[PDB]
Amino acid sequence: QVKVVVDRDVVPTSFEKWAKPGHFSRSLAKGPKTTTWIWNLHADAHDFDSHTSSLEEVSRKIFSAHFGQLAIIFIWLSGMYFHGARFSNYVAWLSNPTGIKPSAQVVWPIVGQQILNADVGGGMQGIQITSGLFQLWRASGIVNELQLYVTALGGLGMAGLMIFAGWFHYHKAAPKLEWFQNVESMLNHHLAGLLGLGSLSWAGHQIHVSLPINKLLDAGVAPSSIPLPHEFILNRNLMAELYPSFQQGLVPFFTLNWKQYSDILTFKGGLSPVTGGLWLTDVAHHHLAIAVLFLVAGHMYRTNWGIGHSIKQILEAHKGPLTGEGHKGLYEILTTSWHANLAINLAMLGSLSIIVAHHMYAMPPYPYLATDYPTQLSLFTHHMWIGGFCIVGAGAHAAIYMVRDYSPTVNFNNVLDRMIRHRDAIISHLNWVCIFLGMHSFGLYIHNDTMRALGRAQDMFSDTAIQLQPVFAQWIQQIHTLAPGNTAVNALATASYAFGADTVTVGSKIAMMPIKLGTADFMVHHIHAFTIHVTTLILLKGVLYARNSRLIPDKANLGFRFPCDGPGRGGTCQVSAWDHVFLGLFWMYNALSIVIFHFSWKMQSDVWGTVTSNGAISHITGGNFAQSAITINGWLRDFLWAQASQVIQSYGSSLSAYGLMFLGAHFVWAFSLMFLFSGRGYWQELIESIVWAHNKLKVAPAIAPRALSITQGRAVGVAHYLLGGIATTWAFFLARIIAVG
């Protein structure tokens, strides 16, 4: 049944245990006799299934910690609304968006760095936004500074409700585990209550705010003659002029004459030719479809009223012959082990963020988003990168399930461990697919590299040479051309203008051009399938060989973050289920580095740029992809040598901070290698040879100065390899596209 039992006055709220660092771990409350206690203090700050095995106390800790995370997010969005309010040129940006570059952050005038304040127009300078906040505010209908101030102060208000909520839900009203293992109610309220009322209420905001406002701004009204969203609901008369179905009220809704709501809601697709964004009639209609569809979706989980499913009777019913037991056990796995839930939710969250990137470049949903190309780039790139990292979090927390929370009694002959019976046949065929795709994704590049270098360009893989025209992608893209007349019957335009008709231009800037895919785009998709399969190899090898390998048959007895076993078996460095995640972060850097190096160079050759008189065309590199992506000298020369030139000449100007975050990120990238290659068997008596020089001058530190441990001494090589490696492409990309677009 469903009932909420809540402990009250769980933990006293004095600052006493803040004076005891490492109070939480009895393995770590001994105090630092060495400096490894300092880093183990932070490596055990959130090992919640290592504090105490009692899942009640753990579950209180995590559920209260989420409110801390949402508190930091409301401080973050209240920060973005205040930097939109006081510091941004958003009010002036709302007048002419295609001329004024978006800027919020206005750099304080200290030595030199006042030159970072870019005169982006609007009469007021500051460093240029690439996050695209102004496009979401024009979409959301924020008119003047007042809604940015007020929505910022409401952001701090919700931040106070999340700090007070998390304090309230760890200390003075914290629930039991029976509240938490009541998971049909949790899905029942997140499908329906969170996402259902979220999309429904957001359809309320778009119909009663954005459709009148972004009809008026689509008509080009200055941001003074625009009435407040306030004034559209005192009377329907200001909206019946704009959309004449508001005159009928809700009466055609309750009589189901929904043909009448073609003014407010429609299915057109394509893009607005005036603003370069999606039709907010289509977007508001869309959030109604998520509204009714998710409120349908929420009510399939029996909680108290004996109507709905339980997950147990679903997973038992799929008792397939080739698995034997069926899915028996997974409702007991996913309601007793948090790390498995974190594996699933980080996989689907990360892949959702990748889906977000791919759906934002080709269907740019905000007005004047595809006009300013840096906000179009970096919202592909950023969501691609967190969309990467969360999949490695799936590959880690799946293994953290498999090491800690695996129990073969509940998990006996089901769908799960029958994989692990033939995990040699899993990982071996991933090994084969990785070699086959590596040959047939990169050997083609060494081929075109040699044939172009050997002069015989007749033997390359270009359109002129031995072609590799992608057949399937061009065919289904041709289906997407033929959607809105044939199959999407009530549509007008296609799903995007990456598919079908001629390009959409706003302010002589190409918003979206139909992307052509020939014989170079092919091979880069096989790069992506390749380096996706390698991360899948390391992150399934990290899970199927997590608990008990055939090399080391007791890894659960060693743990998750153990470094190794020893020099035995000829050396067993880097063998834990954590160490595969260590590897999958480098392959994350590889895979996404060539995803965005496909994105930011195919769409600087095939989509973006300007249009001139008589509708004539001009790309940024000028069609320089298919003759140049086929090689690597074309890739490195014509992309990394040529697109760097606006990052490198950026000194003396407002783009020079990217000229600093470019070199410094090469420094951090290069600085990771010191941690990756060496190890603490060097640094420990290098350091102790310095401890002689402190013992001579009586400057012996009382906390004994060890070197780092092994797993920290490689985790930090990841976290510098990625910070420097990611911030190189960050500074390169924003300094490339701000310098032109």
Partner: protein, 119 residues
């Protein structure tokens, strides 16, 4: 266990090794009779001499250029491993007759493919 069924066994059991009794020169001559017809293929359409009228002869010379390396590695494998003289494929003499069968049957398959690029 799985992919170990009677259709698996009935397909593998009549392959040109797992079949019961064939002389090793013919046992390898079947292997070369397949593979020599095979390896002419990916040198005619995609080879470097597909532009002149040596589209078909370069498949012969290049493919036998592979086959000498293939039988050479066959002689290395039977030279190093398979030391005993049980006279079958697990021997020296039966393996080198398996390799010689693969060579002569492979060159014969090369000539058969070359004379079937006529039609």
């Amino acid at each position: 266990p799985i992919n170990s069924s009677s259709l698996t066994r009935a397909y593998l059991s009549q392959l040109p090794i797992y079949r019961r009794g064939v002389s090793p020169f013919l046992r390898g001559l079947e292997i070369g009779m397949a593979h020599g017809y095979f390896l002419i293929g990916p040198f005619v359409q995609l080879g470097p001499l597909r532009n002149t009228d040596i589209k078909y002869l370069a498949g012969l010379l290049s493919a036998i250029g592979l086959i000498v390396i293939l039988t050479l590695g066959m002689l290395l494998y039977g030279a190093v491993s398979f030391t005993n003289d049980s006279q079958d494929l697990e021997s020296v003499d039966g393996w080198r007759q398996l390799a010689s069968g693969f060579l002569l049957g492979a060159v014969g398959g090369a000539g058969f493919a070359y004379l079937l690029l006529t039609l």
